[PDB]
């Protein structure tokens, strides 16, 4: 019943030779026209959007809060002795901070030394291309005290008591606005309120909050947050090799051999949250230093 192989009318797979040529030629012309049309429409669509600004930014309204160890489940489980147990973490930290070394930021034609103190926002004109390639403020690893990179102690951040730096989701044209007067959550962690976006970590319930002994934050000049002198972002086209601010968080007196949950919440007016997106605004981690 499947002997459609051949016939006396020179049939192959069902039809003749000239028939196969005619149909194949039609399908080639037809599909080629379809592909050319799709390409022409996609070209006009490419002409619709611009090069210095995405036509829609409402889907990233509340910026996120990521970390350096992109864990499989935001959990850091390792052994304080075994160096291979935390190799997957350290390698991810080194590659991340590999673009922050003093030797990486050496050209003065694209880097601008902001300052040792968090300052006001630095707006570099409009987003057009009338100006040249914008400058990017430097951010040395020395700012993240005791969780620095390769300067004196490439500690791997784990000879017990690990480090977890946090990063604000880079958004184009986003101007961070820290809080003010109505403060039912802003703890006195650090004095500097006006030119830094605060970020405070804590447990999640009555259990985690007790298990987590002490947290020490490290930032620009010692402020647990992000300096306003590094915002806003002007896109990858206008600001290549840009380095968004970083802020390290170390957990000293932890409870070894116990998995505890930490929630690092970034506070601010332009920082929204979501009960469906655990990363929008806030941040979570499940650490367990089992010896």
């Amino acid at each position: 019943k499947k002997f459609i192989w051949n016939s006396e009318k020179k049939e192959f797979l069902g039809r003749t030779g000239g028939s196969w040529f005619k149909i194949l030629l039609f399908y080639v012309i037809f599909y080629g026209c379809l592909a050319g049309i799709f390409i022409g429409t996609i070209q006009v669509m490419l002409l619709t959007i611009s090069e210095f600004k995405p036509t829609y930014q409402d889907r990233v309204a509340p910026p996120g809060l990521t970390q350096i160890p992109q864990s499989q489940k935001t959990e850091i489980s390792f052994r304080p002795n075994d160096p291979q147990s935390y190799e997957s973490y350290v390698v991810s930290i080194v590659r991340f901070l590999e673009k922050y070394k003093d030797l990486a930021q050496k050209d003065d034609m694209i880097f601008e030394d902001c300052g040792n103190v968090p300052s006001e926002l630095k707006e570099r004109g409009e987003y057009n291309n009338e100006r040249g390639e914008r400058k990017v403020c430097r951010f040395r690893l020395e700012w993240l005290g005791n969780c620095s990179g390769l300067n004196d102690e490439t500690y791997g951040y784990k000879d017990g008591k690990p480090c977890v730096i946090i990063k604000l989701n880079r958004v184009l044209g986003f101007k961070p606005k820290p809080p003010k007067n109505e403060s039912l959550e802003t703890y006195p962690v650090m004095k500097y309120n006006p030119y830094v976006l605060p970020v405070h970590c804590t447990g999640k319930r009555d259990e985690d909050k007790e298990k987590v002994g002490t947290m020490e934050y490290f930032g620009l000049g010692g402020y647990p947050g992000f300096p306003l002198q590094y915002y806003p972002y002007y896109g990858k086209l206008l600001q290549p090799k840009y380095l968004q601010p970083l802020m390290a968080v170390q957990f000293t007196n932890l409870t070894m051999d116990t998995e505890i949950r930490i929630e690092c919440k970034a506070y601010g007016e332009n920082i929204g949250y979501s009960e469906k997106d655990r990363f929008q605004g806030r941040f979570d981690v499940k650490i367990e230093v089992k010896s």
Binding site: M45, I49, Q57, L172, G235, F279
Partner: protein, 996 residues
């Protein structure tokens, strides 16, 4: 060994009728005048069983529910759901925290099958319920003579061998052996098919137990006279009992529509498994594992199965079936509605189906001029001529010299369909006078009768003398009627144009040829005459005689002739003509004498003028019939006596080389043989019958058509289509609706098959190029089980693009429902454009949100990851999991909308196969509602509060609705120019490839 029992029931019957009155009473042991003792009744009643046919087999409620739950289409859906669960089992033991996509799809397909089964059961149950409300039969007891005393007992209490007396008006209880009759004319309509009432004579007449007159049959009504008889057969052992049991034991066969549905499923699986295997090899050749490749293969085969097409096809057939129910063309089989459209040979019955089965006055001879009376059932024919004085004389003779009139309740009923007591001829005369000469109630009494002389065996005469009416003073009127050749001899005066004239041979022979003309026309002629007895030679008061006949038997005045026959139904001739117009071969299958069958065949259209039989040519050449060549005769009359001695090969020769065939004197079993012979050629057959002799023919045939009232219950249950109004034109309506729904089925199927390309392609390239999912599963369900439901259904209300009743019936081996051309259009061209339109919207949305189309290559890896919340776009921005996932879902919803946009043009182009959309016009109000409801529902599925949380279908930025507009316009323009080239160039390529 039931295969032998069925053949034993197929074999013609035999009897023991030819036995002396002493031999008959010896075989059964029964008294000829006192019957049997009452105690002897319980010896045969509780021995073989009560005199009643065994009820048909019962198929309980849940059986039909399970029948519809399995089917063939539901079988494709069941295997799809099974493959879904198997793929889920292969995916569960492998991935970290799986998805519920396959699980939702499997439960959805199962629910689809169940929903369709419930809807189908509801429709098929409603049909049987109304049939049950129409089949209310009441018991009819028999008049049995037991212990020398008469007793009326239930028919089931009758046994074998007990004297039964049937009076004029009672129905023959069981098969009897006549022993003494008095002019009994039993009506063997439902059983043998003999139209004219056959008289029952105690003496053996014919070898055939049916043609003989000494046998009374079950389910036959005694028209007139009275008779006595011994019960020979009882219950199922009766003639019609064996015919009914044979009908119950026959195979229904495979319907033509189910074979098309199967062939469709065949091509569906062809593409499903072909794409699954080719993409399985491709998936492995790229970088996937066997584990993921099996999941793919199953998903490609399942996603290639039209889920929503089951409900659409079911409702599609249901709509056309409801249009038949509105016109009383009920169908018990939901798929039998199309069967008519594929029929190419209709085997009809003569008595009851084509004719009205009612002896009616056809022609009358008065003043040397034949007058054809209207032979219609609803009185819608040309009226005869009535101005002459001879019409009044004929009307008087017929209305007066006639034994009885109507009955009690026959007052509100119409003049034709009302009951009348007496012989079949007298009733016809009564209806002709009641429709043409006013009334007969006051006309019969106004002429008081004195001495009436009834029909006699010797000196056959039927006369009566009556008193004279209104002042003319001739004082007496002696009317007489009878055989034309006998009444002509006893007549001297002849009425003509009003006056009287002698019996000159010149006009006497003009009467003779008028007798043979009405005889050869297939009717029964009767001569009518009257005479005014001169009151001067014979007294005005009391002067009559009856033993030594005084009234002048001769010298009467002949008025005219009155012929009669059962006329064909009103729309029957036109119906046969319409059927022959579409290319359907009409074949008459009856059990009546050939003399009547040939005339009826020539009058309805089964035999046209000019075509001669093997007998007509021999008579036209005055030569023996064995000389003429059968190839010279276009039409032919096949005698049932010769059909018994025929082989399987000869029947084929009769059907092939002859266009107009008329099978006469064919037993029910012979009707089954003929139906099988017509099916051997490979053509679709439809049998239209009414009596129990058509049950084995209406059962075996692809579709049986029974009469709602004029059809017996057995053949009404063994059939597949019931004509509640008995209007034979319903056959023409049925064939029209069948072909119309066949074409609309092709259209609806193509519309559902076109959507699978832009449905599967997103997942295909999602695997191929490793890009974020362009279209989700929820959206796909909203497409095939959402939007596209109404358009696919409205595509069934479409109407003829040309004259469907002009083209030839479809070829089962050539013109398929879903051929390769439909696949080349849906899966090859149209669906491809819909898929490109979908991908356009996909890239548009993603690129406007920062994710340019080029940057989407290989992004799925980190896109589906729930923990990489720093996914960089083309602008350098970092997106979290839920942010890019919200974009993916708000990218899925517009893809579904894109499907709707391209489906607009797809519905418009699938609305017509050859004509242009402007030649046909979008006059399908349901199709317009199908677009408005589709668009509104789609917009609701995206802008309703809580859709991004319930079905993850986020609202769309308005500018997205215009993304697929150029593609839809392109689909429309392309298919329009395609059908235009097919219109102006009906040559090759554009007709052998696109046209589906």
């Amino acid at each position: 060994k039931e295969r032998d029992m069925d053949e034993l029931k197929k074999e013609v019957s035999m009897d023991d009728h030819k036995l002396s009155l002493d031999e008959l009473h010896r075989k059964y042991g029964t008294d000829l005048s006192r019957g049997l003792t009452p105690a002897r009744a319980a010896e045969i009643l509780a021995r073989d069983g009560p005199n009643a046919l065994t009820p048909p087999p019962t198929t309980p409620e849940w059986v039909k529910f399970c029948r519809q739950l399995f089917g063939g289409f539901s079988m494709l859906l069941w295997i799809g759901a099974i493959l879904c669960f198997l793929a889920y089992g292969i995916q569960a033991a492998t991935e970290e925290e799986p998805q519920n996509d396959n699980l939702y799809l499997g439960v959805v397909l199962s629910a689809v099958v169940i929903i369709t089964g419930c809807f189908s059961y509801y429709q098929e149950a409603k049909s049987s319920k109304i049939m049950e409300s129409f089949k209310n039969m009441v018991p009819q007891q028999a008049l049995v003579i037991r212990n020398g005393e008469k007793m009326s007992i239930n028919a089931e209490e009758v046994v074998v061998g007990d004297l039964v007396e049937v009076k004029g008006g009672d129905r023959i209880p069981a098969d009897l052996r006549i022993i003494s009759a008095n002019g009994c004319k039993v009506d063997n309509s439902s059983l043998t098919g003999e139209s004219e009432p056959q008289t029952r004579s105690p003496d053996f007449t014919n070898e055939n137990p049916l043609e003989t007159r000494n046998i009374a049959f079950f389910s036959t009504n005694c028209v007139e006279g009275t008779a006595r008889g011994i019960v020979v057969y009882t219950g199922d052992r009766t003639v019609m009992g064996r015919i009914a049991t044979l009908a119950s034991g026959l195979e229904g066969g495979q319907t033509p529509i189910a074979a098309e549905i199967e062939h469709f499923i065949h091509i569906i699986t062809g593409v499903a498994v072909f794409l699954g295997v080719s993409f399985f090899i491709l998936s492995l050749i790229l970088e996937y594992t066997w584990l993921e490749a099996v999941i793919f293969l199953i998903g490609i085969i399942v996603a290639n199965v039209p889920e929503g097409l089951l409900a659409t096809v079911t409702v599609c057939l249901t709509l056309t079936a409801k249009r038949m129910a509105r016109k009383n063309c009920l169908v018990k089989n939901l798929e039998a509605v199309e069967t008519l459209g594929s029929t190419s040979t209709i085997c009809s019955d003569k008595t009851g189906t084509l004719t009205q089965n009612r002896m009616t006055v056809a022609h009358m001879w008065s003043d040397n001029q034949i007058h054809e009376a209207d032979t219609t059932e609803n009185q819608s024919g040309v009226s005869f001529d009535k101005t002459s004085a001879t019409w009044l004389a004929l009307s008087r003779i017929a209305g007066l010299c006639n034994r009885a009139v109507f009955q009690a309740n026959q007052e509100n009923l119409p003049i034709l369909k009302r009951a009348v007591a007496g012989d079949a001829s007298e009733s016809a005369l009564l209806k002709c006078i009641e429709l043409c000469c006013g009334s007969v109630k006051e006309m019969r009494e106004r002429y008081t009768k004195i001495v009436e002389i009834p029909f006699n065996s010797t000196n056959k005469y039927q006369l009566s003398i009556h008193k004279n009416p209104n002042t003319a003073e001739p004082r007496h009127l002696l009317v007489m009627k009878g055989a034309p050749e006998r009444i002509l001899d006893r007549c001297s005066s002849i009425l003509i144009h009003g006056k009287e004239q002698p019996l000159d041979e010149e006009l006497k022979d003009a009467f003779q040829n008028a007798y043979l003309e009405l005889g050869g026309l297939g009717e029964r002629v009767l001569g009518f005459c009257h005479l005014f007895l001169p009151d001067e030679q014979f007294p005005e008061g009391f002067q009559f005689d009856t033993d030594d006949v005084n009234f002048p038997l001769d010298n009467l005045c002949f008025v005219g002739l009155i012929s009669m026959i059962d006329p064909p139904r009103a729309a029957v001739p036109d119906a046969v003509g319409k059927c022959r117009s579409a290319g359907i071969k009409v074949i008459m299958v009856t059990g009546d004498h050939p003399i009547t069958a040939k005339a009826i065949a020539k009058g309805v259209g089964i035999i046209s003028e000019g075509n001669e039989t093997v007998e007509d040519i021999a008579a036209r050449l005055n030569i023996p019939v064995s000389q003429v060549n059968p190839r010279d005769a276009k039409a032919c009359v096949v005698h049932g006596s010769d059909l018994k001695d025929m082989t399987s090969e000869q029947l084929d020769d009769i059907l092939k080389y002859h266009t107009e065939i008329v099978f006469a004197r064919t037993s029910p079993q012979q009707k089954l043989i003929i139906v099988e012979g017509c099916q051997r050629q490979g053509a679709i057959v439809a049998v239209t019958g009414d009596g129990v002799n058509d049950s084995p023919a209406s059962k075996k045939a692809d579709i049986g058509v029974a009469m709602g009232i004029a059809g017996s219950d057995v053949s009404k249950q063994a059939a597949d289509m019931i004509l509640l109004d008995d209007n034979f034109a319903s056959i023409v309506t049925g064939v029209e609706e069948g072909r119309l729904i066949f074409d609309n089925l092709k259209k609806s199927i193509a519309y559902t098959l076109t959507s699978n390309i832009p449905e599967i392609t997103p997942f295909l390239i999602f695997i191929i190029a490793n890009i974020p999912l362009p279209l989700g599963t929820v959206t796909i369900l909203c497409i095939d089980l959402g939007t596209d439901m109404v358009p696919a259904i409205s595509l069934a209300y479409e109407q003829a693009e040309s004259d469907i009743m002009k083209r030839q019936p479809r070829n089962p081996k050539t013109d398929k429902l879903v051929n390769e051309q439909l696949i080349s259009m849906a899966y090859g061209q149209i669906g491809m454009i819909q898929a490109l339109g979908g991908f356009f919207t996909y890239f548009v949305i993603l690129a406007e949100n920062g994710f340019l189309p080029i940057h989407l290559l290989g992004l799925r890896v980190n896109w589906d990851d729930r923990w990489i919340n720093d996914v960089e776009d083309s602008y350098g921005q970092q997106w979290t999991y839920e942010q890019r996932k919200i974009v993916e879902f708000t990218c899925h919803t517009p893809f579904f909308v894109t499907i709707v946009v391209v489906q607009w043009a797809d519905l418009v182009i699938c609305k017509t196969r050859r004509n242009s959309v402007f030649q046909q016009g979008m006059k399908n109000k349901i199709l317009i509602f199908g677009l408005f409801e589709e668009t509104a529902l789609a917009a609701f599925l995206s802008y309703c509060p809580g859709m991004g949380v319930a079905l993850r279908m986020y609202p769309l930025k308005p500018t997205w609705w215009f993304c697929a507009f150029p593609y839809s316009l392109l689909i429309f323009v392309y298919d329009e120019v395609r059908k235009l080239i097919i219109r102006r160039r009906p040559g090759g390529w554009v007709e052998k490839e696109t046209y589906y």
